[PDB]
Structure formats: structure tokens, C-alpha cells
Amino acid sequence: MPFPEKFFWGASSSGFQFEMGDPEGKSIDPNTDWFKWVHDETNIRRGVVSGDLPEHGINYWDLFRSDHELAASIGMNAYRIGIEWSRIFPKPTLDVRVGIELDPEGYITRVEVDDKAIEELDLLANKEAVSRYREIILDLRDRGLKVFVCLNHFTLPLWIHDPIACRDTKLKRGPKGWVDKTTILEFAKYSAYMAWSLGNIVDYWVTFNEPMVVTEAGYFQPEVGFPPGLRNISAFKTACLNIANAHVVAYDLIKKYDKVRADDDSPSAAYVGIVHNIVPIKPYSERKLDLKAADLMNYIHNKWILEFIVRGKIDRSLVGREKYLIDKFKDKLDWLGVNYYTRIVLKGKWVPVIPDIVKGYGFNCTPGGRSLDGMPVSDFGWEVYPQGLSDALDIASEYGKPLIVTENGIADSEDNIRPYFLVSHLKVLEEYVEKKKNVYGYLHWALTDNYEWAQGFKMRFGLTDVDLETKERKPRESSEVFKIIASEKTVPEELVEKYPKP
Amino acid sequence: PFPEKFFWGASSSGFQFEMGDPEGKSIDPNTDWFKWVHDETNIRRGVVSGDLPEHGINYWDLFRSDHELAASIGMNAYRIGIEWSRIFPKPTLDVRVGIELDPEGYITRVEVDDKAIEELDLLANKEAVSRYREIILDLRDRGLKVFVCLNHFTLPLWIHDPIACRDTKLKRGPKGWVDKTTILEFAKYSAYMAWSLGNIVDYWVTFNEPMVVTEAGYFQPEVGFPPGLRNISAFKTACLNIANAHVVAYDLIKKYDKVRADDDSPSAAYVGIVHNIVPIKPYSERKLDLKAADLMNYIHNKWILEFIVRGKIDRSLVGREKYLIDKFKDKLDWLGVNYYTRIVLKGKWVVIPDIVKGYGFNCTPGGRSLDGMPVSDFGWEVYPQGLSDALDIASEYGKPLIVTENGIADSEDNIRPYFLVSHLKVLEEYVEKKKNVYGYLHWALTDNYEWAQGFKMRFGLTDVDLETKERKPRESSEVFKIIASEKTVPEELVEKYPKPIF
Ligand SMILES: [Mg+2]
Ligand SMILES: [Mg+2]
């Protein structure tokens, strides 16, 4: 019943949301699509982005040793960080020539990064950024935290994706990001170089964080405020295929250039997974329309990418009307990272059918209010639905890979829901681990407040409050709730009594 | 007796009346006040009541039966508020507009032209516009002269984040009336509403109690208003900006409302302002008490009328400066007078006011004042003679007067009948001797959400049951019916309702 002794307890972070913020300004990375996106005049006036700027952030780039000690002090034994591609290669790697292999239908089944390609990439990489990430990773290991390294977390180098150019011309001029197959080739070089660089201190790799968010938000949901903020159906399907293609070739390249077991316990020297945000879809009724909309949305967001990278089954229509198998894409995943925040309740609409989305549940509730199921609601308007964690893991379990909960958290700047959020969700997780025994860790989002993308700093996810002026960390009560659960390896009934539904 | 076309009616606001729908499809979460009353810190510290506007009386869906109720008791006029946040839930800052700036920094022109209206129409929530159009049309169908208030305290969250302002002491926003851009955006909103509603609306009100917004916002935190700061610098700036916003809105309403909905209206756009006038009684005839009463009367009652009637600007708010802008003179067609009670004060040397307890707004709720008068549930002294004194202060500026608010928090309805009879016989005497008051709007028709106090303060002539939303008229609604329908206070009624012995 208690969580197994080796169960991972930690937090997740990303480069763009954490790193910048130093007082002297020396650590600013202006060379991402997201950096240019949040500084865009038009985006700011329109309310597409918050107007907050990442360069005023919490300064994880220089303060990482303090945050790591904070994480250890509350019983964390694991931690995920993101590497900013734009930091390693501020200037294009397009001139390193590299052998490639193409499937009949056009997919890249192989990017031949050899010794000479590594040498040329070593001459283009920012040695300063590499050594800092090494110092970051080594500080985790020194404090006894197992390191998870994510290679891409939304942001792309500006020479890979200029979102203002893509938006203004509707993808006539670029660089076009994941719409362009060239991005697959460069991401493959970047992945190979990082595995060669850090393979001796990293065993748990992640290629992409929420790749389906990058594509949906970038090309089919402009309301969410992501670059390039278009609604182009063919560009959405192309980016999905390309980013899924990129994972496969990076998976093989990481396996080639990471042959060192940093930890003797690691299941292999290069244990490569993907972080995927799973949303349990709940049909509003058992009517045809509602059931058909739920099935379709579950297929596109939850299942489509996993059929690609685990089964090798490609559906270029994104709606389940086509199946094309590439044997070389089969079983290209070692473990799966499950991000869960809340569910979606949907209706089906006659059009063929299209999701409607019912309000009062899931992602569409009254901020600070109560959902129609009697659950508290975050500052983001998100329903606290702890049972959905079990639903999300059941969907993930279909693909037969070991699971880790890589993100789970709440926007709550005053911390009056987060303790119950931790107690209720970890109760569900504890029973799930004993029952199904295929989940091996819990990574909370996050240790500290950070820059919540298009929402800026006004969404506070941290177990620790951060004063943006002084960069001072002030742990919240929920950090103690986390400490108790992680240290005692169980959810004590005391915590269940003390933190009921607020 | 009152003249034949004397206005008998009531006033209301969007935030205090609209929400309540059980589903509830009408929830407007995008105001500073919505986030303000849902704030757990405010609720925990007693800043706000803990009651939520989503559980209110649902005037948004039930307006037809409330208007029939109003006409049922002899009303011929009704003031409603438009929620800016409902019309423009997303920022309008990218709708570019030419502006003119006085050398002292005041915005003298906001060039809302036809192109600006078209772009604003692309952003407006057409569902909200049509509902307000329905509410106004239903009022006309019952012989109720419509008064439309453009702003009644609440602001869009993209205009004012009161938590960010409070937490950061105005270092992070958006900052509402502290920021001059609010004037520009309010000007665009006023121009759009005149364009869209001008053929059905002739009596316009820019702001309801603007000095209450700034005073309670930036110099009186115990009132419980957002952002709950005390900051005289911000108090001055907000006073100047909201007065600036009235003048430009006045000019743009008259530009885009060229249609006389009623052929006997004074003009196509009769633009007024609703100002709460507090008769200030010095405690004694000493210099200290007289100097403090003069200052208090100047800052609260007179300062903003010096701004928008005479175009005289006082940057200090204490009578130390004098700046004339001819572009600002006579920017007012009529003056709505809100009167609730007086203030008795002393002067203390620091000369600032020292409010004498037992009179006016500072009595023990449900008790007796030191002048022997009944006291509302709010702790407000019932002082009907102050109505004549408040209209005297109003009369100095040479504009037609309408009593736009007058009422009492009295859930048991044991004082309201005397309150009604006594205030209105004072008003009747004033009307025949001064002949410059043309209406009486009671606050309010039904119980509503009384801001920081929630539903505890019941001002309605009609009680409301929040479980079923059922309206239950009080005895005092019959008193109002008799007085309004007979166009005089029958001496029978003065006998029935004398000043109670407690
Ligand atoms: Mg390794
Ligand atoms: Mg008109």
C-alpha cells in the first residue's frame, strides 16, 4: 500500500519558463520563437500574450543550486529540466551535411549523424550553455536527485521558427518550425549532440514535452495564445506528422550516442521517453453525437501520437480514416510521461460531428468558483478532478510502456486548494500504484512559480512562491504537504482529515 | 404635487443584478470585482463577505418580470448599467485611435472614427449587445423611460487586475484608473455603445459615483473596494483620469448618438453623471471644524464638478492649484444625485476630517443616532432633511437634477416605509420651491449583491429568495406605488409611518 521505496518524487521545469531573470541581464536568450512571440507589440495589445516578459523571471539559470536544495529539503529524489535548443545552437546548424534515408511516402526513417557531423556540431554549439547545463545536472546528482532531461519544451530557435513571419504571411515565409521537414533534420542533429555531450550524466531522456500541445495550440486554437497562432488544418496535420517523425529519429540517435549508464540502477544507458498530456474525455451523455465527439477528441489528442511512435501506425488524416505502417517506427518509446491537469466534458454537434465542450467541468470552469460536480476550481479556471488521474493513466496504460506522472499541479497563488489537490490526487495515485503497478514516479508542476507562457506570471503553479522583484523563494504550506507524503511514502489519514475539499 | 412627467423609478447595476442563472450561462468572470470577491485572502480577512455574485437574483434572464413589477407600482423610469467587460471581454488596445494631449498631459481628444467603430464591432460580444437591447426594448414597451449607465464600479480584468495591484502595490497591473490607457479604452467603449444603442437610448450616464471608485479604491481600504490600497498619489491620479474619461466619453456619446429615441427627449444624447453628494455638517463653528468640513465638501462633492462643468482642474484635490482647459468646460447635460445620509465631522491638526460617531454613515447598525434618528442595517443614519441640502450643493452647477439613488438597507422593512414617506415629502417641498429636480430613482427595486457586503444589505422594495429567485414585494413597495401614482405624499401616509420609537 505505501508507495514503493524507489518511487520517484520530484518536480518538472522548462528552460524558457524558469531560466531567465538575472539582474544584470547577461543570461537573456532572445533567440526563440516564444521570446519574439511574447514581445510582439500586436500580441500584447490584443491580449494574445500577457505583456509579462521572461527576462524578468525567477532566475533559475543562476539560482539553480538554491532551488535544488529546496527540492531535496522537501523529500524530492527526482527532477526534470528542459534544455533550450536555442541556447546550445544560437546559430543555424543547417550546414552540417548529414546522410538521410526516406520512406516511400516521404517520412525520414534515418538521420545519419556520424563522427564528423558531431565534430562540426561541437564547433557550432555554445560551450558556455552546455557547461552550465552540465553544472545544473551535476548539482541534482550531487544532492541525490535522479535527473530527467527534456530536449524540447515548446520553444524553438528563431532560425528554426519565426512565428511573427509565419503569422503575418500565413506560412508563406518562414522559418516555419514544425511545418518544415528541415526542422526534423536539425532536431536530430541537436538530439545526437546532446546525447553525446550529456550521456555520461543522464540516463532518463525526454524528446518532447506535450508535442500535441505545440501543434494544436500553434495551428488550430488561436485563443490559447501560442505561436504562430493560426488556424490552418493542413498545417496542423503536417506539424503533427513532422514532430512525431522527429521523435523517432531522435530516439534512435540518442540510443546511438548515449551508451553510458550514469546510474547503475538505470534500465538502460539511454532510456528515452516522451512527455504527453493526457486528457480524459467524458461524453456529456450516451447520445451518438456526444459519444462520437468524445471518441474523436480522445483519438486525436490522447491516442494519435502514441499509435505513431509506439505502434508505428501513421494516420495522416488525424481523424482515423487512414492507416499506414512504418516498421522502422515501431516500438520507438521506452517509457511514457503522463501530464494530467483535468478532464474535458464534451457534447457532439451536427456539422461531420465536432466537439462542443460543456462548461462547468474540466478546463472551462469559473476561476475561484465551483464546478458543476462540486469540485474546487483553480485560478486558471480548471476543475480539480483527482479521479481523472486514474482515467488518464488507464488511457496511457494501453500502450504498454512504464508510466511516470511527469506533470501535475494547480494554478493557486494563495495555496488554499493546492494542499487538498496534493492529498486527493496522491490518494488516487497510491491506490493506482498498488492496483496496476505500472506507474513509477510523480513529478509535480512545479517546485516554484514560473512564467506560464501566454498567461505570463499571473498563473502561480509553485509549491514555492517566488517574489519576482527579489527572486526570493517562500515555500507554501503545500510544500510541507508534499514533504510529508514523499518522506512517509503514503498519504496519512491525518492529511486527508486536515485538508478536505476547500 | 410632483409635476406630470416627474420620473418615478429605480436604479440598478449590471454586477449587482445580472448573475444568478442556475446553469449558469450568464456568468461574467472577467471583472476586477469578480476576482476581488472570489479572493480567498479577502474572504478570510473579512475584506469581502464571502457571498458570490453568480448566486444572485439573475436579472439577466428575469428582467421582463422585474420590469413588469416596476411598472406595477407606478414606475415610469428605470436606470440600468452596461457591463463593459460583457461588451468587450478581450482588450481593444489594437484598435488604433488618434489622440490629442494637452501640455499638462490630459487627453482632450480620442479620435474614434468610422474605421474604429468597424473594428470595435468585430470585437464586441453580439450576444451581450442584443440582450441589453432586449432589456432596453422591454423597458420602452412598458412606458419606462430608460437611463443607461456605461460604468458602475466594475472594470474588465484586462483593464484592472486588482489582486496584482494589491499584491504589488501598483508595480504590476493592469492598474485601472491609475493607467491613462483606461481613458482611451473607455472612450472606444462609450463611442461603440452610443453607436449601437443610440436609437433606443437618450438619457446617458457615463459613471456611477466616480469619486466612490477612487476614494474606496486608493484611500479607504476598510470599505473593501478594489484594489484596497491607501496611496494618495494613486488616489489623485485615478481621480484625474476618471474625470478625464468622463469628458472624452461625453464628446464621443454625443458624436455617435444622433438619434432621439423619444421625440420629447431634451436631445438625442442627454449625457449626465451620477454623483454621490454627502452634506457635510461641521461639529461646531470653530475654525478647525469649519476648515475640515469645507475641505471634505470640496474634495468629495465639488472637485469633480469643477472638473467637468467649469473645466477647472485641481491637481492637488485640496484647493492648492488651478488649471483651466476650455475644451473641458460644460461637459455635462444633467446631474444625477445619489443621497443616502450626511456626515458630521470635526477638524484635527496633523487639518484632516475627524468623523464624529453616532451620525451619518457611522452609527451602530439597527440602533439610534445621536440626533434620535433610526439607523439602517448598514449603520447609516436616516436623515431626510439632508436630501434638500444635497440638492442645494448639486444646484450650484446650474444643471437639471435627478435623484438617481435613495434607499435604505432594511431587511425587515420596518424603517423603509418611514424612510420613503419622509424623504419624498422633503423632495416634494423642494420640487415646488426650487423646481430643478425632475426625477426620483429609488435604490432599489429588488434586493441585490451589495458589493463587499454581499446579500446582507437588502435595499429592495422587493425581497428576493436566492434559492428560487422568487420576488416578494415588501409593504414599502405599496408605499412607493401610492406616492408615485398619486404624484404626492398623502398625509394619510405620514401618519401611518412616523419615525419609529426604535
Ligand atoms: Mg546515459
Ligand atoms: Mg439617442
Per-residue three-class SS string for A78-102: EEEEECCHHHHCCCCCCCCCCEEEE
Integer Cα distance of B37 and B163 in angstroms: 11
- Give yes or no for a contact between A9 and A76, defined as CB atoms under 8 angstroms apart: yes
Which residues, 6+ apart, have CB-to-CB distance to B14 below 8 Å? Answer: B28, B80, B81, B82, B83, B86, B152, B154
Ligand 1 centroid distance, CA of B84 (Å): 57
Integer Cα distance of B380 and A26 in angstroms: 59
Give me B452's grid cell: 463587499
Give me A348's grid cell: 457532439
- Give yes or no for a contact between B379 and B364, defined as CB atoms under 8 angstroms apart: yes
Give me B271's grid cell: 449625457
Closest CA of chain A from B52, distance in Å: 9
Exposed/middle/buried for residue B466 (C-beta within 10 Å: 0-12, 13-18, 19+): middle
Give the sign of the dihedral formed by CA A127, CA A130, CA A135, CA A138: negative
Nearest to A52 by CA among A466, A411, A412, A468: A468
Q: Which helix (H) or strand (E) holds B492?
A: helix B491-496
Instruction: Return the number of other C-beta atoms located less than 10 Å from residue B372's C-beta.
Output: 8
For residue B331, the Cα-to-chain-centroid distance in whole angstroms is: 18
DSSP secondary structure, A48-71, as one string: SS-S--GGGS--HHHHHHHHHHHH
Q: Which helix (H) or strand (E) holds A439?
A: strand A439-444
Give catalytic residue positions of B: 209, 405
For residue A458, the Cα-to-chain-centroid distance in whole angstroms is: 20
Residue A367 has its nearest CB partner, among B29, B90, B94, at: B29
Contact B35 A458 (CB under 8 A): no
Residue A366 has its nearest CB partner, among B54, B93, B163, at: B54
Give the 3-state DSSP-derived string for B430-485, with helices as H, strands as E and coil as C.
HHHHHCCEEEEEECCCECCCCHHHHHHCCCCCEEEECCCCEEEECHHHHHHHHHHH
Instruction: Return the number of other C-beta atoms located less than 10 Å from residue B496's C-beta.
Output: 12
Angle, CA B501 vertex, CA B496 and CA B502 arms, to 5°: 115
Residue A366 has its nearest CB partner, among B27, B41, B171, at: B27
End-to-end CA distance of chain A: 26
Integer Cα distance of A35 and A18 in angstroms: 13
B496 SS3 class? helix
- B161 known member of a binding site: no
Sheet holding B280-282, edge to edge: B280-282, B343-348, B352-355
Residue B94 has its nearest CB partner, among A46, A413, A458, at: A46
Instruction: Return the number of other C-beta atoms located less than 10 Å from residue B152's C-beta.
Output: 25
| Phi/psi-derived region of residue B487, left when phi > 0, alpha when psi is between -120 and 50, beta in every other case | left
Q: Which residues of B231-254 are buried (b: 16+ CB within 10 A; e: fewer)?
A: beebbbbbbbbbbbbbbbbbbbbb
Ligand 2 centroid distance, CA of B249 (Å): 15
Contact B93 A45 (CB under 8 A): yes
Contact A46 B163 (CB under 8 A): no
Residue B91 has its nearest CB partner, among A47, A359, A360, at: A47
A446 SS3 class? coil
Gaps (C–N > 2.5 Å) in chain A: which residues precede them? 351
B368 SS3 class? strand
- A260 known member of a binding site: yes
End-to-end CA distance of chain B: 30
Which ligand has the nearest atom to the CA of A268?
1
Q: Which helix (H) or strand (E) holds A120?
A: helix A115-124
For residue B189, the Cα-to-chain-centroid distance in whole angstroms is: 18
- Residues from chain B that touch A416, judged by Cβ atoms under 8 A, are 40
Contact B29 A414 (CB under 8 A): no
For residue B285, the Cα-to-chain-centroid distance in whole angstroms is: 32
Closest CA of chain B from A141, distance in Å: 37
Integer Cα distance of B96 and B289 in angstroms: 50
Please name the amino acid found at residue B501.
I
Give the sign of the dihedral formed by CA A177, CA A178, CA A182, CA A185: positive
Bridging pattern class, strands A335-339 and A344-346: unpaired
- Angle between helical axes of A182-198 and A115-124 (0-180°, round to 10): 90
Residue whose grid cell is 418611514: B418
- Residues from chain B that touch A452, judged by Cβ atoms under 8 A, are none
Nearest to B135 by CA among B186, B85, B83, B88: B83
Residue B90 has its nearest CB partner, among A47, A360, A381, at: A47
Interface test with B, best of A223, A345, A458 (most B CBs within 10 A): A458
Interface test with B, best of A40, A41, A42, A46 (most B CBs within 10 A): A46
A41 SS3 class? helix
Give me B35's grid cell: 476576482
Which ligand has the nearest atom to the CA of A256?
1
Which residues, 6+ apart, have CB-to-CB distance to A412 below 8 Å? Answer: A378, A379, A418, A421, A460, A461
- Give yes or no for a contact between B186 and B241, defined as CB atoms under 8 angstroms apart: no
Contact B38 A369 (CB under 8 A): yes
Give the 3-state DSSP-derived string for B227-262, with helices as H, strands as E and coil as C.
CCCECHHHHHHHHHHHHHHHHHHHHHHHHHCCCCCC
Q: Which long-range contacts (CB under 8 A, 24 or more apart) does A358-365 make?
A: A358/A284, A359/B25, A360/B23, A361/A282, A362/A279, A362/A282
The answer to whether the bond into B444 is cis (omega within 30° of 0) is: yes
Give me A258's grid cell: 548515449
Q: Which residues pair with A404 in a beta bridge?
A: A337
- B114 known member of a binding site: no
Technique behind the model: X-ray
Pick the catalytic residue from A19, A186, A407, A430.
A407
Residue whose grid cell is 428560487: B468
- Residues from chain A that touch B122, judged by Cβ atoms under 8 A, are none
Bridging pattern class, strands A472-475 and A439-444: unpaired
Please name the amino acid found at residue A465.
D
Ligand 1 centroid distance, CA of A195 (Å): 8
- Angle between helical axes of A60-73 and A127-142 (0-180°, round to 10): 10
Nearest to B335 by CA among B246, B428, B424: B246
Give me A151's grid cell: 530536449
- Angle between helical axes of B475-486 and B416-434 (0-180°, round to 10): 20
Integer Cα distance of B95 and B175 in angstroms: 20
User: Is A105 a residue of the active site?
Assistant: no
B90 SS3 class? coil
Exposed/middle/buried for residue A396 (C-beta within 10 Å: 0-12, 13-18, 19+): buried
Instruction: Return the number of other C-beta atoms located less than 10 Å from residue B134's C-beta.
Output: 12
The answer to whether the bond into A175 is cis (omega within 30° of 0) is: yes
| Phi/psi-derived region of residue A400, left when phi > 0, alpha when psi is between -120 and 50, beta in every other case | left
Give the 3-state DSSP-derived string for B271-320, with helices as H, strands as E and coil as C.
EEEEEECCCEEECCCCHHHHHHHHHHHHHHHHHHHHHHCEEEECCCCCCC
Integer Cα distance of B338 and B402 in angstroms: 9
Integer Cα distance of A480 and B106 in angstroms: 52
Bridging pattern class, strands A464-467 and A472-475: antiparallel
Give the sign of the dihedral formed by CA B262, CA B268, CA B272, CA B274: positive
Nearest to B53 by CA among B42, B37, B65, B40: B37
Indicate the Cα dihedral angle A170, A173, A175, A180, nearest 10°: 70
A205 SS3 class? strand
Residue whose grid cell is 489582486: B163
Integer Cα distance of A45 and B94 in angstroms: 5
Ligand 1 centroid distance, CA of A14 (Å): 20
- A192 known member of a binding site: no
Contact B38 A368 (CB under 8 A): yes
Report DSSP state, residue B175: B
- Give yes or no for a contact between A456 and A51, defined as CB atoms under 8 angstroms apart: yes
* Helix/strand/coil percent split, chain A, to 5: 40, 20, 40
Residue whose grid cell is 461588451: B87
- Give yes or no for a contact between A494 and A5, defined as CB atoms under 8 angstroms apart: no
Q: Which long-range contacts (CB under 8 A, 24 or more apart) does A212-218 make?
A: A212/A240, A212/A276, A212/A277, A212/A301, A212/A304, A212/A305, A213/A154, A213/A277, A214/A154, A214/A178, A214/A239, A214/A243, A215/A178, A215/A239, A215/A240, A215/A243, A216/A301, A218/A177, A218/A178
Contact A45 B171 (CB under 8 A): no
Nearest to B205 by CA among B256, B158, B146: B146
- CA neighbours closer than 13 Å in the CB half-sphere of residue B312: 11
Which residues, 6+ apart, have CB-to-CB distance to A40 below 8 Å? Answer: A48, A49, A164
Give me B231's grid cell: 496611496
Nearest to A254 by CA among A319, A307, A213, A196: A196
- CA neighbours closer than 13 Å in the CB half-sphere of residue A185: 16
The count of CB pairs under 8 A between chains A and B is 39
Exposed/middle/buried for residue B448 (C-beta within 10 Å: 0-12, 13-18, 19+): buried
Which residues, 6+ apart, have CB-to-CB distance to A167 below 8 Å? Answer: A227, A228, A229, A230
Q: Which residues of B35-59 are buried (b: 16+ CB within 10 A; e: fewer)?
A: bbbbbbebbeeebbbebbbbbbbbb
Compare all CA atoms of chain A with the CA of B172 and give the residue at the minimum distance. A52
Q: Strand (E) positions, A313-425? A: 313-314, 324-325, 335-339, 344-346, 348-350, 353-355, 403-407
Contact B90 A458 (CB under 8 A): no
Q: Which residues of A touch B (CB under 8 A)?
A: 42, 45-47, 359-360, 366-369, 381, 413-414, 416, 458, 468-469
* Helix/strand/coil percent split, chain B, to 5: 40, 20, 40
- B426 known member of a binding site: no
